[PDB]
Structures are given as structure tokens and as C-alpha cells.
Design a protein around this nucleic acid. Sequence first.
RNA 1: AGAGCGCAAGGGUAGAAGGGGGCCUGACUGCGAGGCCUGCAAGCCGAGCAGGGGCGAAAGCCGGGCCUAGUGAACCGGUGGU
RNA 2: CCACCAGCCUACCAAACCCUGUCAAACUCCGAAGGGUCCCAGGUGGAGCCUGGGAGUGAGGGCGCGAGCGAUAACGUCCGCGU
RNA 3: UCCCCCGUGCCCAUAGCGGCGUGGAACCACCCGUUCCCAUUCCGAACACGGAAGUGAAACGCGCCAGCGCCGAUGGUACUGGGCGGGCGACCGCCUGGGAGAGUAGGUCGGUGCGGGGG
Lengths: 185, 181, 50, 35, 99, 141, 84
Amino acid sequence: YRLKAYYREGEKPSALRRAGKLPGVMYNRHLNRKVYVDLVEFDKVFRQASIHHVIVLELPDGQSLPTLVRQVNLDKRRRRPEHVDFFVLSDEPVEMYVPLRFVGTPAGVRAGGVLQEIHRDILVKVSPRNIPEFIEVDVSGLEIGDSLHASDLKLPPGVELAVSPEETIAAVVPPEDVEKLAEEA
Amino acid sequence: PLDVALKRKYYEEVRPELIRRFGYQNVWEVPRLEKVVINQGLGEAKEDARILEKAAQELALITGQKPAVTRAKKSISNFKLRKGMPIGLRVTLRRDRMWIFLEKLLNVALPRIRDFRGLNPNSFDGRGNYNLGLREQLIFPEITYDMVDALRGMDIAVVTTAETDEEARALLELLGFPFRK
Amino acid sequence: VRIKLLLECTECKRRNYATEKNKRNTPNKLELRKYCPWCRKHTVHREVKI
Amino acid sequence: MKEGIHPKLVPARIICGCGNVIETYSTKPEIYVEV
Amino acid sequence: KFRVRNRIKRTGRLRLSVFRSLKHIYAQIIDDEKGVTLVSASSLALKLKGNKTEVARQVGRALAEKALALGIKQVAFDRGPYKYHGRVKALAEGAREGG
Amino acid sequence: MLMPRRMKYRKQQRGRLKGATKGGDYVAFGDYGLVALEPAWITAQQIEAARVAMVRHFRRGGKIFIRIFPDKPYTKKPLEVRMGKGKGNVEGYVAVVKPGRVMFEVAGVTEEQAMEALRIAGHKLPIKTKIVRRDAYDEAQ
Amino acid sequence: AHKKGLGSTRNGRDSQAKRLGVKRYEGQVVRAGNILVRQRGTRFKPGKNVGMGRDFTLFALVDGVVEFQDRGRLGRYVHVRPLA
RNA sequence: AGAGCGCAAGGGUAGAAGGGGGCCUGACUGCGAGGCCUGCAAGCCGAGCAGGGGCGAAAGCCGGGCCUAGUGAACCGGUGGU
RNA sequence: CCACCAGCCUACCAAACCCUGUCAAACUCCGAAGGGUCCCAGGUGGAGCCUGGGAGUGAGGGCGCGAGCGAUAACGUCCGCGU
RNA sequence: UCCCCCGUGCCCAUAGCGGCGUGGAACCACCCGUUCCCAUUCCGAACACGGAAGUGAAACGCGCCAGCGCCGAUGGUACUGGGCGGGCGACCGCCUGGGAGAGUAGGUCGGUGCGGGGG
């Protein structure tokens, strides 16, 4: 959504992050302009982000344009952001990751079981005009072990896909215990 | 241009049956014969080697063309023989020769297969070829009793220009094959 | 190892040598292999002793 | 099939036990069978 | 599939890169490095006779005089599946001397 | 326990423990997990100490994703003996792990539960630990 | 001091590292004889005025200036061009 | 090119060094440019030359085998020989 | 569940297969930093060349970082450039 | 001077694997014959030799599609000669010149000298 992003120059990105104005790069087709976000509200509004949303950058140059994320840099040690890449948007069908609203509590589930959320994010191509928020995948009649995948989900008319089709989107597995002391052997 | 009864048969027979139930409107696409090869793959000339080969050379006499003794390649530790030079006869046959071959074959070899219920419509290689096997070597018209020792079949290797199912079995049925049904 | 015993291919014409090795374990008998002595050309060369 | 000692050719019959007079060109001069 | 660079054996020194293609014999002389060639003798594209072995003969020694006019001396017969069938034109009495 | 039964070089040296996780400090698996804090070797025997008190405390529990595999020989040598005389034997089969590397997680459990469980589980692990969810740990397979 | 059971080995032997590598680089002049590479396999391949005897080793034929050759689809070559 | 390339691997290799064949027999004579190596001593790659010979129409190849071990200074003697 | 030969399969064991995470000195698709070497130029310095006589000197040891052995113990102890 | 095809070198998969489309009047590949040079560890496959009919199917020459393959910025981290420090340590931070991998973007189903056959 909203996030003030100020242009960048040639200073050291070291200072940037350790002053607040956190270093991040954006591009698209030919461009590769240099900016930075801020520490607090970028990280805050990013929990509400990921590549599921349309982030506005309000550059103090009289411009204010939307992007999607891409390639984030954690600092490994003391794991927490230290760079972000932002691919700008258009309106011709392009690719990103769809979230799967898991809906349904079947029989492996309830009677034990553990949810197996595999591709919580799947690779799909959508027209950026209709940016569908989410897609609901349903377990429903799924016993422990078995799985849901391929063309079993919802695909909005503007939503087209390209993953396997095979690849398991989600599944269920046995919930473990202390009778594994017996298995222990 | 030696003319055999199967030559004039396959000749006219293949063409318009294919031109009518099929039709590859381009005179040279209709696939026909190709290579007629035969190979028995023993490995029982562990020793007694090429004395078991003379048994296979009288076979070369029945078709009319000498064979080449092809071989193993690795190190077998069960039925003996390592390195790789046993009794794997691969004999190669062509146009007019395959004609007298499959002449005596389709005319008088297939009837004494006493187990006869029909050629296997399932041993095709789906690329216009048709491999199978057999049991007796004397089922080939010109090898009387006083010559055969133990047992000797062979693995019939007939490749055709074909490359699709229906038309493979069709070419063969236009050549006069005794299949399943 | 022997059964492959070595020899000095002495030539005729009263000497001139080149040194080699046999092979008793192979049907190799004596050996008059064509070699070139210190004096002349590629003439003869037989086999002698060890 | 040139070479040296190639096992020959020549014509042959198929005087079957039915009444077949098939003309052939096989290694054996005179054969005859069943059908 | 007679690549091998039989032409690596023709990297040697000087080149005569021929190739017969059914009908015409596309025999050529090539100087190397520069990739600059020289001769393009043929059978049927030469507008001479019309048989394989005959033209060959004559055209071979045609090349003779050709090279002996342009102050050369020797080159090297070249092909993948050549086998060499004499054609005692064999472009060597044809100029090269290499025969 | 669990480890390879016959690898390549039995007697393998110690080396060096600098830092960076090498990669594999996201989540990608279970609901809540545990992250290392001190750059070094980490024991298998201790991995199973963890798994013991863990899956013990919460019987009939969920599932465990242990992204850690302890296959590096200990160089351990006899007692009351002189120096030299050989090199240590393939004892304690441990792993090369630095901080950050999301060691191990569970799923199908409630927050507070994963909290306490992984609290003691990680507590046991021969150092100090951190406990992580699956929020800002997005996209880096 | 009761020194409980010990052991022994076999891994004390080590082959003698004979000097390897290329001896000349682009520029230097060989004089027929000045070898240039003590290599194993064709890490570098001979060409113009460069020979290669029995040990896979490129050397000297002329009074040449050294140069390399990148060929990838055949590997890497070492050529020599003297005066001309 | 993970096959095979005698026997350890490493490395390299199919645009062969692999696998089959015809004619042979250069595991030659006299040298030796110049380098690698290194205290020495040995070890080592070897253009090119002169005799003569094999192969291939020829270009051209042959002073052993894809290679990195298959080694023993000097006296004391033994055989053939100048 | 039949033989003209086969039809057929499990909330059974079970390779290949791939996705997800993956570790390695003797694994290498990519590969730095640097280091090493030759050409040009500067570099006047108890530099370098050649020869000759005169020397000695060859258990080295604390320290830093790169590897080992120990046990990620030793005023341990073994190489490495550096001191 | 130019377009096309056939012999060829060169950059070295941005060059190719797949799919689709297309011509053969010329060159080209087949094709037919094995009388004939050649030759099959056996085979007219072949390498050849003798060329009518016929073909553009397989081969090929050219394109259109990124689907696989490959190339892959750079924003930027990992590290690293040089120098400086903190703790018991394992290791860690600072200033300087440098600075990959990964993969994000994107790209490419390539281009160039000679020679000849045709307009």
C-alpha cells in the first residue's frame, strides 16, 4: 500500500539502513532507479505486504508509482532486512505468487493429522488490471498422507497458471507422539 | 531384379490398399520393407564354442547369406564367460534376399509351429519393426533330421520403413502374415 | 619376470647389436627381426643368448 | 552377398500336400512341403 | 560422419578442399589462415563434359596448368569420406605433384 | 540417532567455524521453530536430547521438521595414553551449524505450546537459542 | 603409567611432487629446445611452430614469440609466432 | 563422452589415445639445438641434421605403447667381438 | 482369476523420478581477493651480475593470521608467508 | 554492386534440443542397376561404380513459436592484499582499494571473410 520512498544517489548504503532510510532498489524493463524506504513503517506495512499486494512508492520528486517486491536481503546474522528489490508494474499479464486460503477440515484432519501447507505461494500469471487478492484451495475430503494439487483449485477467468501441473499445493501427515519411544528401537 | 512370388504379391498388394484405406499423397512416403535381420543370443558356447557355431552356419545356408558373430561386452560371472566373445549370431539380410527368406518363411515355416495359434500382435516395437522369437531351427524347410543336435530357436528381427501401429500390421497383412486374429 | 627372457639381437656380418626381449610363453621362437646396426642400414638382426 | 563361399541360390518348388505349385528361388533346388 | 577432422590431417600444410556431391564434383583449392581459397574446378558447372570419372581426369590436369600459371607448387587433397578412387586426374599430376 | 552408515573418509578433520549459515535460515516448513546463536559444531546426541524432551512433553503432538543433519566425525582418542600414536576415531557424529540457521520446527500445534516446547527443546541444545514463526520469512527457496 | 591399547598406520607414504605447470607465457622467446609446459593431459594444445613430445609437453621449434589461443569447442591452445 | 583407454589414482581423451584390418617391424646408426629440474650426481621434453628403411597416390608419419612407478654410481668379473 | 494370453490390484512393502531444504579437503557448473611472471618506464641504491680467496651456519624461539595433530586442552607440537 | 542455393573458414551453445511451415526449374538428397572400379570381421547398408522413370518423404536450405537449453544486467551482499582495534575463547566490528556466486530484470532460437552456380 502506502510507503514514502526517497530517491538514492551514490552514498554508502551502510549509512542508509543505520539511519532509518533503508536501502532498496527498483527496476522494470529498462529502468533501475535508486531509492530507499524507511526502517519502521516499511517493515510494518511489509507484514501486510509480500508479493501479494501492490505497494505504492511516493517519491518526493512529484512521482508516486506502484511496484511488487522481489529478491529481499536479510542480514543473515541477526536476521532482519538490509535490502529489497522492487519490480514495477504495468497491466499486461505477468507473473507472481498466489497465496492459498486453505478452506476445509477433512478426515485425516480432525481425527489427528497435521496440515501440510506446501506451495503456500504458487507461480502464476495474471493480468495486472485484475489483481486477484487470493485464491481459496480446499482440502475437504483429504485423509492423512494424501494431497491436493494441480487443477483442483479456483482459477479466476483472468487467472492463468504454470507450475507443473502436478506439484502438491498442500497435504496432511501423521501427528507424532511418545509411542515413538516404541518405534525408537 | 529377381522376381519372387512374394515380390509380385507385396508389389501390387501394398500400393492401392494403402492408397485407399490410407493415403500419404506423395508417392515416396508409403513405408515398406527395410532390413531382415536374425539373432540368436546364446552364451552356451561357454566352451565347445565354434562347434556350436557350425550348427548356426547351416542356418546361414538355408537363407543363402553368411552371418557375422556378434558378441558380449562385459564380465559375466554366472553363465560363465567374461570380456565378451560368445555365440551371438547377427545375420543381416536385404531386398531380394529377404524375399526368398520370408518366402519359405511365410509359406512353409509358420505351419509347423505345432503351438500355432497365430503371430503375436503385441510384440511390435511401434516404430515400424516387429521382433519375436522361435523354438526349432528345423521349422525352416531345408534342414533335415540328421543335422540338428539339442535345441535351437532364433529371435526374428524384421525392421520396416514404417513408424506407426495400424500401418505396420497392415503392411504385414498385405504381405500375408498369420497373426493372432 | 622371465618366460619372457631378454636377449641382445646380435646381427650377422660379424657383430653389431640392438637389445630386446623374447617371449617363451608366446609361440615366439628365435627372432630375426629387421633392425639397423651401428654400421650400415636396416639389414637383418637375429637372436642370441641372454 | 559376393565374397567367396556363399551358400548359393537357385529355383525350387512347393509341391505341397494340397496341390500347390509355388515358384521359388531358394538355396535348395527342390523343396516341397504341406501348404 | 567422417569428420574426425581428417581435415586436421589437412591442417598439415596447404589445402585442396574438394567434395563430390552426386552429380558435379565440387573440387576446390583453399589457401588457409586467410580462409582464402583459390580454385573452384568442377564437372558439370564447369560447362565441360558430363561424366564423373572422365571430366575428373581432364579437369584434374586442367587444374595442373592453372596452378602452374599462378606460381604455386603443392597443396593437399581433402575430404571426409574420400576413400580415394584414383581418378588419376587425382589433382596431383594436376599441378600439386603430390601423386 | 541417525547418520550415514558408510560415507567416504572415516577419519575427517575439524576445520574452521566462521559464519553465515551458508543458507537455510528461512522457514519454509513447520509452524514454529528454532534458530542457532553460536557458530560451531552441534551434536547429534543433543539433537535427540531435544527431540526426546520435546516430543515427550507433548505426547500425541504434531510433526517435526529437523533441517539439520549431524554427519561429521569426532576425532576422539583413548584415555591415559601418550600423544601421537595415531589420529582420533570417528566418534561423535555432529554437524556444521552457525547462528541463524533455522535448525528445527514443528507444525499442527498452538502458539503457546510451540513456545514452551521449543523453549525447553532448544534450551537443551548446547548453546543459546531463538524461536521463530513464519511471517517475515518469505520467499528464498 | 598404564598406557591402554594403541594402534598403527600405513598412510605415512607420500609421492614426490615433481615440478609441474607451464614454463613460458605470452612474450618470451624460445630457441628450438626451450620447453614451455610440463602438463599432464591436454590442458593446453600445440599448434603453429610448437611441438609436443612424450609426456604431454609443448616446446620449441623456432625462435618464436609466445601466444595463447582460446578455442573452447576444442579447448585451449598454445601457439608460437616468431618473425615472418 | 559418466564407456573403454594392461595393472594405483589423478588427469586427459571419442574432431581418439578407443574397437577391426592390409603391408610391415623406427623398443634404428652417427648426433644433438635448447630448456625443466636440481648442491652434486642422476633423472627429463627433445627442433633439426646425415645414412637407410616401412607405410600411405600424396600431404606426412615412425629414435617404442595417452601419460605420472615397472629402478641400482663406481669399481671385481663373465661371454661374444675390435 | 483364465488360459489362444492374460485380465487385475491394495488407508501393503518397494527403486527410478522430482519438488522442497541440504553437507563435503581428497566432490567441482562459476570463481574472487591476491599472488606469480614477462614488456615499457621511472627506481642511484651496503642493489643485481661474474670471478676468486676468506668466512661461518644448518636443535632456532615468543607473536600474528592460513591448515594439522590434541579434546574447536597444553609455556603441546608439526608445516605456511609474515615478524 | 545486389537476393537465393551448393563447397568452406571463423567467432564458440545468445550458436542448439523440440514444434510448426516451405522449395527443388538450378544446385542438392534420394532413387534405380550392381554389367563395372570398390568393398562388406555378413549385408549394394556402406565406400563405391552405371544413370532413365520418379520424389522433395527421410536428409537438407530457409523461416515462425522460449516450451526446454543457454546467455545473466546489476542494486547489492560473501569474502579478500593493506591497516586499526574488542573479549578467556570460538570469533567479531571499523577505514581503504577491490568484489564473485546466486538468482531478480533481460536477452538469444545466432553472425562473418573466400569460392562458385543462377537474375
